[PDB]
Each structure stands twice: as C-alpha cells, then as structure tokens.
Amino acid sequence: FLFGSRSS
Amino acid sequence: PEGSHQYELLKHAEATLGSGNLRMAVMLPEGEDLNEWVAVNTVDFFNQINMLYGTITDFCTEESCPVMSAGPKYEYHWADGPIKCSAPKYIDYLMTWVQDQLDDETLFPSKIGVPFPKNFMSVAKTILKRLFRVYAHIYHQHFDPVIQLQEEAHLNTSFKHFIFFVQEFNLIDRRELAPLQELIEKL
Amino acid sequence: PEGSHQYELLKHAEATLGSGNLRMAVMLPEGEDLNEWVAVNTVDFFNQINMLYGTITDFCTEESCPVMSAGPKYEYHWADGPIKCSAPKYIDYLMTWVQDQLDDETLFPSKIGVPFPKNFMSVAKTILKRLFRVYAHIYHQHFDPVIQLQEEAHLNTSFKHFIFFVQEFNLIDRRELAPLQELIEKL
Amino acid sequence: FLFGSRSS
Ligand SMILES: [Cl-]
Ligand SMILES: [Cl-]
Ligand SMILES: [Zn+2]
Ligand SMILES: [Zn+2]
C-alpha cells in the first residue's frame, strides 16, 4: 500500500 | 477468462474500437454489469500500459530518471505515512501494487458468478489514477525512444482509449489529468 | 505469450485500431517478422469469431440450419479424402480444425525463438479462408439474433478488421469473399 | 483434416 503525492 | 462471457466482453471492447468512435465504443453495453465492464477494461489498460512501458524500459534507468517526473512542473512521491524513488523504482511499486489488486480474488474475483466488492469502483479509480502516471512519464520523458521504436501510435491510441474510458465512468479526477491536459484537449 | 514481444505485438495491433484507420493499423510494423505479425492476428481473429459465434449459438441449431449456408446462393460442404453437415456441425469441424492448427507447435511455435514453418503463410491462408465462412453464416443467417443481442458493432467492426487485414497480406482469394462482397465494398 | 467445397 502506497500513499502517493504530487508536487508542482 | 474461460470462454466466459467476461472474456467475450474483453473481445467486445477491443473489436468495437476499430470504428474509431471511442466515445461510443467505451459505453456500457445495455444490461451489462457496470463493475464487470470496468473490471475488464481496467485489466486491459494495465496489460497495455505494462507492455507499453516495457518497450522503453531500457531508456528508463536510475540515471536517466532520478526522480518520478511528469515534466518539470510535476513530480510524484511515494510514502508509507517521503521515500523518494527514481522513476523506474516508483513505477515498479505502482505496477506491482496494481497487479496485486488484479490478483486479489476479493477485489477482482476470478469466478464469474461472484459479485465484485462493495467498494469496487473505488479501487478501480485508484488503479486508473495511478496508471495515468505511467502514461504521463512516458510522454514527458521518453517520447523520443517511443518515436524511434514506432510505438507512438500504439501509445497515442492506447492513451486516447484510456481517457475516453475513464471520463465516461468518472474514474479519474481533473487534478490527476493535469500533467497532460494539453495532449488530452488536443482530442 | 509471457510478457514476450509477441504478446506486445498483439496489444500493439489491438490498440492501434482505435484510430479507426484500419488500412494503416494492419500493416507490418517496420522490421517486424511477417509470419509473427500474421500469426498474432490469426490467433486473435480466431478468438474473436469464436466468441462472436458463441453469442448466437443458441440460435444456430440442427433444426434452424440443416445445411451450411451463406444465404441461398452459397452452400458449403466437408468431405474426407460428400458429408452435408448442419451449419453447427460444419462450424464445429472448422473451428476444431483451426484450434488444432493453433495448438500445433510445428505450425504456431509456442516458443518465441523458434522460426515458423516454411509453409506458414499457406496454413494461415487456409485458416483465414475458413474463418470467413463463420462470418458469412452469421451475417446471412443470424443477423437478427445479433441485432437483439447488440453484438452488431462487435461483429461489424471485427469483420472490417478481418477484411482489411486479410487483403493487406493476401490471405484470402476473391472467390472466397463472394458471399459477402456486398457488405465488403460497403466499407 | 477437412476438404472443403462450396456451391451455388
Ligand atoms: Cl496515489
Ligand atoms: Cl476448405
Ligand atoms: Zn523514465
Ligand atoms: Zn446457423
């Protein structure tokens, strides 16, 4: 299980 | 897939794209189980992007792609509650995670008579959101390997299929699609 | 199909039909083994017409179709070395025969490094000639079950794919296509 | 192995 984030 | 109706549904979905009207081809055939239709297409989008990423994986290395990028503006991270991954490390976690879901009998029952779980549309969304990123990283970072290998139409046509599909059944939000909304709108 | 390049070639072929330009989608990708490309598409046309015939097989019975018909003008027979069989008997022989070929390691090697036999284009032709007839019998004799089941676009788009494919690589002669040359030229 | 014929 992965918790994914994105950044700008 | 045992010559089952579910297998027919996959063949049905693939054949009907040849009309080139993807917007109609991706709709629920009348009287069909929604979950089943989404399931079948989710599985096929996975195999598709898997083979797609597979064609350029020699160009995607720890060196070439130190971070998980979608162009300069956009960068992804995994965590367990920030483990930074190279793109091929990130994508390995993503696809392994996705495979694992598809291999979970509680989520994608291999038995055609077993109903999908109550939250199935939710797991399908999460999967498809994540599969988007592999498309995004290919476009923004390896479109030239893709050109020289001549798997550009394959990538383009697979991605067009994916978008129309996912917009039809509300499987991906607008924020997720942002690193490719240029390419999208072009359609 | 093991995540092999051959499996990729199948996904490649299916995705690229979504452009709807079947005439280009069916051409040999540059540098690709001809035999392999034909093999992959032959196998998929078999699964396709198999699932297709499968949707209306309750409507195809010993009583409904006493002979192997392609409309009034055209009628097929099997013989060994003249055995009128009912359409479902004829089609069972045909598809079993075709399956058997695809299951023959000497003809369709399951091992990606093994060259196809010298006469491979010849066996592919014979198969595709025969697969035509199942399309022909469906159109001329069960198009109404097909309509009510809503597998008409599936049938039409599969058949359009098949024709363009087979014309591209010279796999079926003009005489064989005659019981459907109306529908054909229509697209 | 089948030998196939057609008529009209
Ligand atoms: Cl995520
Ligand atoms: Cl024959
Ligand atoms: Zn990369
Ligand atoms: Zn019949």
Numbering used by the authors:
A (entry chain E), D (entry chain F): 3 to 10
B (entry chain A), C (entry chain C): 20 to 100, 106 to 211
What did the paper state?
To exert full kinase activity, MST1/2 and LATS1/2 requires coactivators, the scaffolding proteins Salvador homolog 1 (SAV1) and Mps One binder 1 (MOB1), respectively. Phosphorylated MOB1 protein is switched ON to increase the binding affinity to LATS1/2 and this binding accelerates auto-phosphorylation of the activation loop, A-loop (also referred to as activation segment or T-loop), of LATS1/2 kinases for full activation. The phosphorylation of MOB1 occurs at two threonine residues, Thr12 and Thr35, located at the N-terminal extension out of the C-terminal globular MOB core domain, and is required for binding to LATS/NDR kinases. Here we report the results of structural and biochemical studies of full-length mouse MOB1B in the autoinhibited form and that of the MOB core domain bound to the NTR region of LATS1 (hereafter referred to as the MOB1B-LATS1 complex).
However, we successfully purified full-length MOB1B by low-temperature expression (see experimental procedures) and quick purification without degradation, and determined the three-dimensional structure at 2.2 Å resolution. The overall structure adopts a globular shape comprising the MOB core domain made of nine α-helices (H1-H9) with the N-terminal extension, which forms a β-strand (the SN strand, residues 5-9) at the N-terminal segment of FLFGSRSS (residues 3-10) and a newly formed 4-turn α-helix (residues 24-38, hereafter referred to as the Switch helix), whereas the 10-residue linker between the SN strand and the Switvch helix were poorly defined on the current map. Notablly, the SN strand forms a β-sheet with the S2 strand (residues 95-98). One zinc ion is coordinated by two cysteine (Cys79 and Cys84) and two histidine (His161 and His166) residues and linked to the H3-S1 loop and the C-terminal part of the H5 helix as found in the structures of other MOB proteins. The Switch helix-binding site on the MOB core domain is formed by helices H1, H2 and H7 and the H4-H5 loop, and is characterized by a conserved cluster of negative charges with nonpolar patches. This site is overlapped with the LATS1 binding surface found in the structures of the pMOB1A-LATS1 complex, the Mob2p-Cbk1p complex and our MOB1B-LATS1 complex, which are described below in detail, suggesting that the autoinhibition is caused by Switch helix binding, which structurally blocks LATS/NDR binding. Positively-charged His24 forms salt bridges with Glu51 and Glu55 and bifurcated hydrogen bonds to Glu51 to lock the Switch helix onto the MOB core domain. The phosphorylation residue of Switch helix (Thr35) is located at the edge of the interface with the MOB core domain and forms two hydrogen bonds to the helix main chains. Therefore, once phosphorylation occurs, phosphorylated Thr35 structurally inhibits binding of the Switch helix to the MOB core domain, which is consistent with previous reports that showed a critical role of Thr35 phosphorylation in LATS2 activation.
